[PDB]
Amino acid sequence: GSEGKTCGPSSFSCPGTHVCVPERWLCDGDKDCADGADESIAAGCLYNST
Ligand SMILES: [Ca+2]
């Protein structure tokens, strides 16, 4: 099934490749991007604070 899973409303693309990743997966712990971009500032995960 997986409805609206792959490349959801806010699908992010991993640099150096064409791999999408739903915002839900963005910085979730599972390095989907070859260089864990989604789990880094490369994806836009600046907000942290403690
Ligand atoms: Ca991720």
Query: Could you say which DSSP state residue 30 is in?
Result: S
Pairing type for strands 19-22 and 11-14 reads antiparallel
Measured CA to CA, the distance from residue 15 to residue 1 in angstroms comes to 27
Q: Cβ distance 12 to 23 under 8 Å?
A: yes
> Around Cβ 14, how many Cβ atoms within 10 Å?
19
The encoded tokens of residue 36 equal: 């864990």
- List Cβ<8 Å contacts ≥24 apart for 14-21: 14/38, 15/42
**Method of determination?**
NMR
Residue ranges and CATH numbers for the domains of the chain are 1-50 (4.10.400.10)
3-state secondary structure at position 17: coil
**Ligand 1 centroid distance, CA of 27 (Å):** 4
**Ligand 1 centroid distance, CA of 37 (Å):** 8
**Ligand 1 centroid distance, CA of 6 (Å):** 13
**What contacts 27, CB < 8 A, 6 or more positions away?**
38, 39, 40, 43, 45
Backbone angles phi, psi at 7, to 5 degrees: 50, 70
Measured CA to CA, the distance from residue 48 to residue 4 in angstroms comes to 27
Residue whose tokens read 């971009």: 37
